[PDB]
UniProtKB/Swiss-Prot annotation, chain A:
UniProt-recorded name of the protein: Lon protease homolog, mitochondrial
Originating organism: Homo sapiens
Localization per record: Mitochondrion matrix
Active site: S46, K89
Domain comment as written in the entry: The Lon N-terminal domains are crucial for the overall structure of the protein, maintaining it in a conformation allowing its proper functioning.
UniProtKB/Swiss-Prot annotation, chain B:
Protein name as annotated: Lon protease homolog, mitochondrial
Protein family (similarity comment): Belongs to the peptidase S16 family.
Description of its domains: The Lon N-terminal domains are crucial for the overall structure of the protein, maintaining it in a conformation allowing its proper functioning. The AP-domain (ATP-binding and proteolytic domains) has a closed-ring conformation in the presence of AMP-PNP and its N-terminal entry gate appears closed. Upon ADP binding, it switches to a lock-washer conformation and its N-terminal gate opens.
Quaternary structure and interacting proteins, as annotated: Homohexamer. Organized in a ring with a central cavity. The ATP-binding and proteolytic domains (AP-domain) form a hexameric chamber, while the N-terminal domain is arranged as a trimer of dimers. DNA and RNA binding is stimulated by substrate and inhibited by ATP binding. Interacts with TWNK and mitochondrial DNA polymerase subunit POLG.
Organism: Homo sapiens (Human)
Length: 100, 50
């Protein structure tokens, strides 16, 4: 998770300068962050795209679109890679009614 | 074999197999332009102590 965290910090910096150059949030603004514990470390990279979705969400300040959740690994470029255990994830996600 | 990957022979428990060793930068090098920090590796693939 430290690898996913700083890899996401950098790519978020990169994505902000790539997309909205006038903004300078991720390149210069201190940010404490917290991620709830509980998941197995092997799937934790799956959360990294969520991490970026949070960081950029605060960056712009725009609230995330309601009733959706995403999971996936990142490699400082934004590409996603496979994550296991999907049969249990989808049922436990459905019990809460998430649809996206 | 684009750079950072290559086939590598392995004498498995029975026969052998062309296991592809994979290597890649995992977190950006540029933690600081002035930073002297080493590139510590985080091995995977059921690492032994030796």
């Amino acid at each position: 998770m430290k690898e996913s965290a700083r890899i996401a910090y950098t790519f978020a910096r990169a994505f902000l300068m790539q997309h909205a150059p006038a903004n300078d949030y991720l390149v210069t603004s201190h940010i404490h962050l917290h991620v709830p514990e509980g998941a197995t470390p092997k799937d934790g990279p799956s959360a990294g795209c969520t991490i970026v979705t949070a960081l950029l969400s605060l960056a712009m300040g725009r609230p995330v679109r309601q009733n959706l959740a995403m999971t996936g690994e990142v490699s400082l470029t934004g590409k996603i890679l496979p994550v296991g255990g999907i049969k249990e994830k989808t049922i436990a996600a459905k019990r809460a009614g998430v649809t996206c | 074999t684009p750079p950072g990957v290559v086939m590598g022979l392995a004498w498995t428990a029975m026969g052998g197999s062309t296991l592809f060793v994979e290597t890649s930068l995992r977190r950006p090098q540029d933690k600081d332009a002035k930073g002297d920090k080493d590139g510590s590796l985080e091995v995977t693939g059921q690492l032994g102590e030796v």
